Design a protein around this ligand. Structure first.
Ligand SMILES: *[C@@H]1O[C@H](CO)[C@@H](O[C@@H]2O[C@H](CO)[C@@H](O[C@@H]3O[C@H](CO)[C@@H](O)[C@H](O)[C@@H]3O)[C@H](O)[C@H]2NC(C)=O)[C@H](O)[C@H]1NC(C)=O
Ligand SMILES: *[C@@H]1O[C@H](CO)[C@@H](O[C@@H]2O[C@H](CO)[C@@H](O[C@@H]3O[C@H](CO)[C@@H](O)[C@H](O)[C@@H]3O)[C@H](O)[C@H]2NC(C)=O)[C@H](O)[C@H]1NC(C)=O
Ligand SMILES: *[C@@H]1O[C@H](CO)[C@@H](O[C@@H]2O[C@H](CO)[C@@H](O[C@@H]3O[C@H](CO)[C@@H](O)[C@H](O)[C@@H]3O)[C@H](O)[C@H]2NC(C)=O)[C@H](O)[C@H]1NC(C)=O
Ligand SMILES: *[C@@H]1O[C@H](CO)[C@@H](O[C@@H]2O[C@H](CO)[C@@H](O[C@@H]3O[C@H](CO)[C@@H](O)[C@H](O)[C@@H]3O)[C@H](O)[C@H]2NC(C)=O)[C@H](O)[C@H]1NC(C)=O
Lengths: 438, 438
């Protein structure tokens, strides 16, 4: 028996579906979303880590000269000075007083611990939703892992379940992403090969193990002081170490809809948005023939107490007359009130109790026990607690019924005004007819 | 010196850009797309391969009964038969005449070579382009590998190049893709866990190493014949073997725009569509001071022969008076004609020759030698060869100049008719003015 439904994408909300086969007693399912996971698709752009400047020892040439040699090193620098007269602890070598040269050399390189501490720059698009649902009906429990898209069928006790694509297409990750350890940032990073010194991305590597490196950190050599051997240099500080202390905010403490961001793999979890269509296919063994089900007649519904609070703040009583004692399925056909239980024990005593949760001043809904029906109306008083540590258990519907107190007053006033207008129109029509018949 | 341009995405087309700095002599670059690659993004769905049926030896219970036991195996079928009386070569065992029992057991499993011969079912989206552009100018000649999007800057001899995103967003891969060896198929495969027996996807595995397996081949057991031990069964043949014989076509021999499809990784190469914006940043050492370059005056452009064919079938001549000899940078400012060379040696003899390729009956373009200018117009005759094995070297513009023979005839006829109409209008105006003056 094929069936379909639409259920909210809220974690912990006890959705109940009612299936009415005409040759069998009604059946009630319960589906709950234990966990979700919004998995995006990532493409690595480059990898940034702190750099490490390498300064080889100077080559002081005594009584001669040396020439600069170019090399293919990241941000390589080389210069030759003239007129150096160095000194050491024992004395001063380079016997020639003035005709000596010193060759300074330096270049940048990736750090030693870059494999353990680096920031990745990604591109995020086309998120894929994956969920873990709990399905319980009849006497079968289970929890399953289902991809939320129209092409994954999972069977739970002979029933084939297909969870349709999510209603919305909203993702909390922008096009460009920077990932560091366990934090995700919505950042716009410079393109590869065009990084600026002192800021994020001064040195960039295509991959952790990639040999190629692009470095732009304004390394500049200076002339050594007289009578010294030190190879002076200057360089703008690391851009990664600066970005560490001035990155600002995150996405963990910034994401909308109250969903946590994690890493490895990057994903946003338990993130309440949209609706999830569901398609089923049940075998004949799930239902019970109508002859076995108890026969219920003369169903009347009364409400003892009501309080439109987050938890189940209502009590329901049903009176009936039965021939045998068995099991019925209880369902509410409107989303203004949600029943706590899905089955009840019908007995010859003719009285059962139910719990429901509502969020309107005056609810009106029809409840069914096995095959019977009954219309319930009640007056609910507001609660007293200001704040509670648990989520809402109702569908958040506030508009009262047309038979409520406020709507009754509105109806009475509008009826009086309409009666006055009708009398006015009748008098005017009578006068016009009398005038025209003259 | 920042510059920007737009160059076609055609392999082998010799695009030349003209950079005219106000303080320096003009420059002509040459860019060429040697190779192109279009890489989609794939998400593996499952793996399919030929199955193998495992039939354990029957358990014949002499003088007794046996009971079937359920197991968690892919497509497990077990049945118990009564009244069997097996036989062997020497004699029949199970002494009891009819109180025997045989237990038939069978189940299906992944084949032995499924790790070597299998087809992957992907989902392809958000293709990314990548090219290999050869850039040559002055004394620079190099080939670079570039990502064709606004986020990769590559330095060629001191100049920064940023190749913008492709103009169009056309990709030849549908949403769903099936890959086999070196062939890509545009196919719609059944969802995981809902495969049908006999067709593609009868057995599905989430990954080649994944332990779980979904199998649905309609394996059914039958009662053994009297006096034999054989465990009969019937099964729908493999779906992979049907698919290999009824897959139909491919994408290698079906893709538009004449672009080859290759596998490992999945990619479409040399696929001519759209335009590639190019951004540049040149240093001041590439140009030459206008004082050093020769001065050109009294430039006349005369066309010797023209034939609007695919190759460079036009010969051009330039006459000039120059003070000193050096190098110039020729260029054509209209895409009607495409020159072959981007540099000519000027001499005191005042005569240089150039080749161009055009595809219109009567072209009209303005050519510039260093800083001079000249307008060229010529009459071209069609070529006789019907088919040639090389691509067109022109921009394929056919509309002739307003000075061409056909448009000259049109202009003359329209002018005659307009003169007639103007004369008639004047006659009518004079007549009506005289009439109104009375
Ligand atoms: C031992 O110490 C003496 C100290 O003078 C060194 O003699 C010096 O040798 C250099 C290299 O041959 C000379 O430089 C040359 O200078 C001329 C100009 O006169 C120039 O044309 C050459 O190209 C070269 O640069 C230097 O003049 C000379 N000293 C003097 C005072 O003339 C000698 O090289 C040392 N030997 C060793 C093994 O250390
Ligand atoms: C379907 O399976 C789930 C999970 O096994 C069942 O939920 C489990 O319900 C039992 C009680 O019926 C829970 O045990 C008790 O939980 C309370 C929670 O405060 C704890 O204080 C007690 O010490 C005791 O452990 C159990 O925790 C709970 N499991 C989970 C994961 O929530 C569910 O009841 C099953 N369906 C049916 C119809 O039984
Ligand atoms: C040697 O051969 C004799 C053949 O007579 C075997 O005796 C057979 O033993 C089995 C033991 O299970 C008897 O089966 C039983 O049959 C009764 C009545 O049908 C049934 O109610 C029980 O549930 C059980 O199935 C079988 O009747 C009996 N054959 C007879 C009495 O003719 C003996 O087991 C053999 N010894 C071996 C194989 O070691
Ligand atoms: C700019 O540099 C490229 C390479 O960096 C030059 O490409 C060269 O192109 C010519 C022909 O287009 C190649 O010569 C060919 O060699 C093969 C070898 O079998 C021969 O069969 C052909 O008939 C032809 O002679 C040459 O190898 C190639 N240079 C390479 C690959 O290094 C290009 O010519 C340069 N630009 C200019 C204006 O010279």
């Amino acid at each position: 028996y094929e069936h379909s439904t639409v259920m909210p994408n809220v974690v912990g909300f006890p959705y109940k579906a009612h299936i009415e086969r005409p040759g069998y007693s009604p059946l009630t399912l319960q589906m709950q979303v234990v966990e979700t996971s919004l998995e995006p698709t990532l493409n690595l752009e480059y990898i940034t880590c702190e750099y490490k400047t390498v300064v080889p020892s100077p080559y002081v040439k005594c009584c001669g000269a040396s020439e600069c040699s170019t090399k293919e090193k990241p941000d390589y620098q080389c210069k030759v000075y003239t007129g150096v007269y160095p000194f050491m602890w024992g004395g001063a070598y380079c016997f020639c007083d003035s005709e000596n040269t010193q060759l300074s050399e330096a270049y940048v390189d990736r750090s030693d611990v870059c494999r353990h501490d680096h920031a990745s720059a990604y591109k995020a698009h086309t998120a894929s939703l994956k969920a873990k649902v709990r399905v319980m009906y009849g006497n079968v429990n289970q929890t399953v892992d289902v991809y939320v898209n129209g092409d994954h069928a999972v069977t739970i006790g002979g029933t084939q379940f297909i969870f349709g694509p999510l209603s919305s297409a909203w993702t909390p990750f922008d096009n460009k992403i920077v990932v560091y350890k366990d934090e995700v940032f919505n950042q716009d990073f410079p393109p590869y090969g065009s990084g600026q010194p002192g800021r994020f991305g001064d040195i960039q590597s295509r991959t952790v193990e990639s040999n190629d490196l692009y470095a732009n950190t304004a390394l500049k050599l200076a002339r050594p002081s007289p009578g010294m051997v030190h190879v002076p240099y200057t360089q703008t500080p690391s851009g990664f170490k600066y970005w560490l202390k001035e990155k600002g905010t995150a996405l963990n403490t910034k994401a909308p809809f109250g969903c946590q961001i994690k890493t490895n793999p990057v994903r946003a979890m338990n993130c309440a948005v949209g609706n999830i269509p569901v398609s089923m296919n049940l075998p004949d063994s799930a239902f019970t023939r109508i002859v076995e089900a108890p026969t219920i007649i003369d169903l009347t519904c009364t409400v003892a107490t009501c309080t439109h609070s987050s938890d189940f703040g209502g009590v329901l009583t049903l009176t009936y007359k039965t021939d045998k004692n068995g099991d019925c399925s209880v369902h509410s056909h409107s989303n203004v009130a949600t029943l706590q239980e899905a089955t009840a024990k019908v007995k010859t005593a003719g009285k059962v109790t139910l719990h429901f949760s509502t969020a309107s001043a005056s609810p009106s809904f029809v409840v069914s026990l096995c095959s019977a029906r009954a219309t319930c109306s009640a007056s609910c008083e507001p609660p007293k607690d200001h704040i509670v540590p648990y989520a809402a258990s109702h569908s958040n519907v506030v508009f009262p019924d047309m038979s409520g107190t406020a709507l009754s007053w509105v109806q009475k006033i509008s009826g009086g005004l309409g009666a006055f207008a009708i009398g006015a129109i009748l008098v005017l029509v009578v006068v016009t007819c009398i005038g025209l018949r003259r």
